[PDB]
Design a protein around this ligand. Structure first.
Ligand SMILES: Cc1c(C(=O)Nc2nncs2)sc2nc[nH]c(=O)c12
Ligand SMILES: Cc1c(C(=O)Nc2nncs2)sc2nc[nH]c(=O)c12
Ligand SMILES: Cc1ncc(COP(=O)(O)O)c(CN)c1O
Ligand SMILES: Cc1ncc(COP(=O)(O)O)c(CN)c1O
Ligand SMILES: [Cl-]
Ligand SMILES: [Cl-]
Ligand SMILES: [Cl-]
Ligand SMILES: [Cl-]
Ligand SMILES: [Cl-]
Ligand SMILES: [Cl-]
Lengths: 358, 364
């Protein structure tokens, strides 16, 4: 069964937060949150309430066995103050897949989307409109059984919090990546293709190691052929002339060790629609990248994700071998084009079915 | 060497007793808790004073990194009450060592292992009447350390909470007689990978197993046999380490368990079984990879005596069946006594309940 937006209960805040006057990601929260509880009677009524702490039993399975998943998606405000969510249906789809993998309760994707819309509407004045700014939406679903048994929970909590977010860049600044095969994010037969809290905790130490070695983010390698899987919390794309002499955009396939990014899917959809070069999903190895760089066949390498939309890469430290990636010497033409078509769509400059109006 | 330890100190313990003690049990595992809990907070000025307080809810900021990015780890260890009503913890130092390794892996704050152990001893002392004394019963101790940064940044937290809760637990085997389990051995599900975090007791390793355990039941099995590698190595059973007692391919009787290569949690019971068998000096004790091919051959040749899991939950658990590639493999554990299992159970019982003095026991 599902909670219904029709049953929403609104508790407006009596202690509104002061709004920002330099926005740093994930530190500043809006005045309200969504909360829906689930138990043996099913889902309770959803409520929009003032941002507040959670009260959890010390044995909550969310805290002992990581019965927890989350999402991340942005709302954008156009010039005329219309707020729109980018492809939120895909986030709902992904959140439901995560829930099933952790044996957490199902819900109706459109009911949740409408509750989220209602929440953003309430806090609409928190949505910034300066260039490159957005409102970040963080849904979370956790198990909440007061039992140390490793088992399917009979209680759960679903909540959503919101953060206004500043510009990521106006001009794209590239990043350096540490590529060490010692580090593994996910594996075939694992859960790297679900947005589960458990996938992220172990990366904290690795990211520290990337900084210690003078890099900004982690290029996650997998397997004996040192496959390039993902970069930090972004999918990875390479724009090059492949070994067969064909200009192509390649990104690793959804074979279980990649999170299916919404931006990733959008970039594939956009480039396939242009019909100007080959667009493929295929494994990418460090062997191929090295050879391509030596042959001058690499144009651009970048990450995709909700944080920045598209992020150029200029350097990869592969163990002790420092590799220059010529992205910024090549425009970066494709990155700029993607960033432009997404900006026009996201801020309402071009009407589009990918946007969900609030 | 001039600075005081950054760790919280048992010397600074603060005590608050419950106003309404709950009535003890007259029992499913892990649902019944005692009257008090330990809590310690960590922030930018370090560890606060540890406190024993009435069992109560946690209050967490909704952005807590414990809930978004699984900055969480835990331990599990037991205290046992002897005939002298004396309570003793089993090898708790090893649990403290493992907890600290887990904390470092998740960039959570270090602490002093002996200070935590003393705080835990104090908590159990307060709730001593909760420790059962019936055959096979014990008190399960659940320490937890979680990150608690109020921000969505994936980063080392500047805030953390360490707490400890207690559960009285009934006999694992009703009647005090081991009963065997059946295992599903399907290589599609992989618990952990080399270079991963399977050798740490992190919450993240457990949530993904819930669906797999459900599949095992759906297929008529009781627990999961976790296989690894293209050669289907037997790694662990559910939340237990795995042991095989057999005559090996070289004709030598041995007890074998997989080595600590990174995909195995280093169990305290596992180490104790190795230690115990080595001390006896009656047969070869070895840490070596075990493959399904090896087990299949050993079974066909009548070389397998006993297969069992080890862990804090039951100490030792026999296995009588493994479902692998749609085939049901009978494991003759019970037909072989199970001699070794029974011997291990008895020696552990005598140590844990204080029938024999032993350095492994830590008195409360
Ligand atoms: C969404 C986001 C970040 C992030 O960490 N996102 C995750 N998604 N999953 C796990 S962390 S870092 C970051 N920096 C700037 N602006 C952003 O919007 C932003
Ligand atoms: C400690 C324990 C269990 C357990 O789930 N332990 C974990 N350790 N790590 C993760 S779960 S199940 C169980 N059943 C009976 N008696 C017990 O003492 C017991
Ligand atoms: C591991 C991982 N990979 C890729 C992405 C990019 O996903 P999206 O484009 O949906 O933001 C994210 C962020 N959700 C991530 O956490
Ligand atoms: C994966 C795994 N393996 C083995 C064990 C057994 O560990 P111990 O003997 O320390 O209880 C546990 C429980 N800690 C576990 O969670
Ligand atoms: Cl869509
Ligand atoms: Cl997928
Ligand atoms: Cl953005
Ligand atoms: Cl010891
Ligand atoms: Cl280890
Ligand atoms: Cl026991």
């Amino acid at each position: 069964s599902s909670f219904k937006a029709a049953d929403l209960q609104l508790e407006m805040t009596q202690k509104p937060h002061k709004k920002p006057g330099p926005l740093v990601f994930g530190k500043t929260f809006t005045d309200h949150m969504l909360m829906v509880e689930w138990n043996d009677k099913g889902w309770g009524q959803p409520r929009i309430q003032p941002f507040q702490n959670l009260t959890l039993h010390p044995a909550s399975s969310s805290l002992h066995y990581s019965l927890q998943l989350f999402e991340g998606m942005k709302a954008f405000k156009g010039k005329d103050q219309q707020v729109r969510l980018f492809r939120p249906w895909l986030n709902m789809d992904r959140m439901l897949r995560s829930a099933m993998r952790l044996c957490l309760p199902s819900f109706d994707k459109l009911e949740l989307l409408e509750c989220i819309r209602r929440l953003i509407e309430v806090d609409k004045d928190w949505v910034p409109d300066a260039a490159g700014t957005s409102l970040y939406v963080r849904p979370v679903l956790i198990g909440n059984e007061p039992s140390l048994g490793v088992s399917q929970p009979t209680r759960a909590l679903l909540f959503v919090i919101l953060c206004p977010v500043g510009a990521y860049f106006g001009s794209v600044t590239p990043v350096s990546l540490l590529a060490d095969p010692a580090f593994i994010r996910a594996w075939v037969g694992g859960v790297g293709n679900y947005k589960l809290g458990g996938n992220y905790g172990p990366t904290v130490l690795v990211q520290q190691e990337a900084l210690k070695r003078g890099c900004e983010q982690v290029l996650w390698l997998y397997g004996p052929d040192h496959q390039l899987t993902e970069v930090g919390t972004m999918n990875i794309f390479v724009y090059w002339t492949h070994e067969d002499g064909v200009l192509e955009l390649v990104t690793p396939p959804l074979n279980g060790v990649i999170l299916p990014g919404v931006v990733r899917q959008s970039l594939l959809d956009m480039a396939q629609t242009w019909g100007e070069f080959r667009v493929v999903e295929r494994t990418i190895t460090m062997k191929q990248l090295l050879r391509a760089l030596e042959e001058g066949r690499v144009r651009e390498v970048f990450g995709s994700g909700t944080a920045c939309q598209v992020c150029p890469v200029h350097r990869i430290l592969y163990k002790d071998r420092n590799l220059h990636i010529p992205t910024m010497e090549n425009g970066p033409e494709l990155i700029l084009r993607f960033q432009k078509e997404l900006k026009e769509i996201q801020y309402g400059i071009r009407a589009h079915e990918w946007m969900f109006p609030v």
